[PDB]
Ligand binder design. Structure first.
Ligand SMILES: [Mg+2]
Ligand SMILES: [Mg+2]
Ligand SMILES: [Mg+2]
Ligand SMILES: [Mg+2]
Lengths: 262, 262
């Protein structure tokens, strides 16, 4: 069926994008979408429009669900779907020129088959391939050791939570860190550097690649109620070492839950 | 004898410890100090030992103030002084093997002359040399663009301030990130990636190198009351872009200050 051949083409596209991003940065251009903190650049747009055109030339029947376009349009009954976040970490890109990524994920009959989180700034490509595994620049990633929460660093956006449940999380974990790109905080979970990453209101594209990684590396990836996540619509989600999953959810839901209140 | 000859010696020594570090990671052991989360590893100790003997054997008159030994010897009087954080971000080293550095600073008659923040995991050596300037791997750094607080990412430890000032700092700024190693959160401010980094209780080695970087790149580095800092003792401190230093200190000192009880 081979996914290995499709992988080869995706990786070849990613090498071509390597040479293209420098000139996009060279003529960078910033705009805001819904508020002053919601950024898009020509980089985002151009990376996306280019995969779209790659998809049309090499995979004309395949559909695309991507951040910087209408997804009117995508439905529950579609055989070949690619979910794309062309730059996950746009705020990092613009403000830092560091700690953003490209997220790509291919779904066959709803089932994740290929996934890509490309940390362009560090030249590290994490990929996952149903049947072969998950890799970082080609070296095989393995299931990470067990981490109990009290031993684990954790990552979440603390601005978007009430401070009571932020505190309970600080008190229950080893320490707290933030990269600020869902892709990259998730890959830190995947490598056992963090015990868990939480995003309370992610988009489909912000989490699309992670499903396959979570599956192949024996991580947990769920709603904040422990349920399967619909990959088409987002959901408040968590990616977690298996040893600290229930505990984080329990804390998040305790005492009336994690939502702001003021 | 010249500053460049000293610099040449130190980079050379830093670069040769690339070869040592991986072996020490692979045989890594851990101990705690004043509580269970105040970690120290064989890597912290070996790196310090090896520098003390490098100093013994090149600049024998020179003294060493460093984290993993006593520094009862001192006085504002000691002519040639080195301050070293053999591993800044020991928790990160331990939990992640990423986002730690090595901090060195040379002080002649109390005046900063040479500084180093070595980001070993990414092989980025930041140095500062009075007379030549500041550099990352030989690529010269220049004073970063003006950053108002509301357009800038900030970095601090939210577990150790009262949560009202945490909230105000979130509210007033573009966003919050944390690397978790003072030297590295400090280099992100030097590169213009962050508007500011705060550490409410640094030891002298956690901030030694940053004085000169701050001087040469027109950063503001003060206590949380805006005063000069004694390199020999810590103080609660900020390193900041010029355009947001004042606003950040106002926010920290507002309403009885920043500690848990105010
Ligand atoms: Mg966006
Ligand atoms: Mg995006
Ligand atoms: Mg220490
Ligand atoms: Mg240290």
């Amino acid at each position: 069926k081979t996914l290995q051949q499709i992988d080869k083409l995706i990786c070849s596209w990613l090498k071509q994008i390597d040479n293209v991003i420098p000139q996009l940065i060279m003529e960078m251009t910033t705009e805001t979408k819904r508020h002053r903190f919601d950024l898009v650049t020509n980089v985002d747009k151009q990376i996306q429009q280019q995969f779209q055109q790659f998809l049309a030339t090499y995979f004309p029947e395949h559909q695309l669900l991507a951040e910087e376009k209408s997804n009117a349009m995508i439905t529950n009954e579609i055989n070949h779907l690619w979910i794309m976040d062309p730059i996950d970490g746009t705020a990092n890109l613009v403000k830092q020129q560091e700690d953003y990524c490209i997220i790509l994920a291919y779904f066959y009959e709803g089932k994740p088959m290929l996934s890509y989180v490309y940390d362009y700034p560090h030249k590290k490509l994490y990929k996952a391939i149903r049947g072969e595994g998950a890799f970082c620049n080609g070296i095989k990633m393995e299931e990470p050791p067990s981490l109990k929460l009290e031993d684990a660093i954790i990552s979440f956006n603390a601005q978007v939570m009430n401070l009571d449940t932020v505190q309970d999380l600080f008190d229950a974990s080893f320490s707290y860190r933030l990269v600020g790109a869902c892709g990259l905080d998730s890959m830190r979970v995947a490598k056992g550097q963090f015990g868990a990453h939480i995003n309370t209101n992610p988009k489909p594209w912000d989490i699309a690649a992670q499903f396959l990684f979570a599956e192949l590396l024996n991580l947990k990836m769920t709603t904040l109620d422990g349920k399967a996540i619909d990959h088409l619509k987002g959901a408040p989600f968590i990616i977690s070492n298996k040893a600290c999953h229930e505990t984080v959810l329990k804390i998040l839901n305790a005492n009336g839950g994690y939502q702001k209140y003021r």
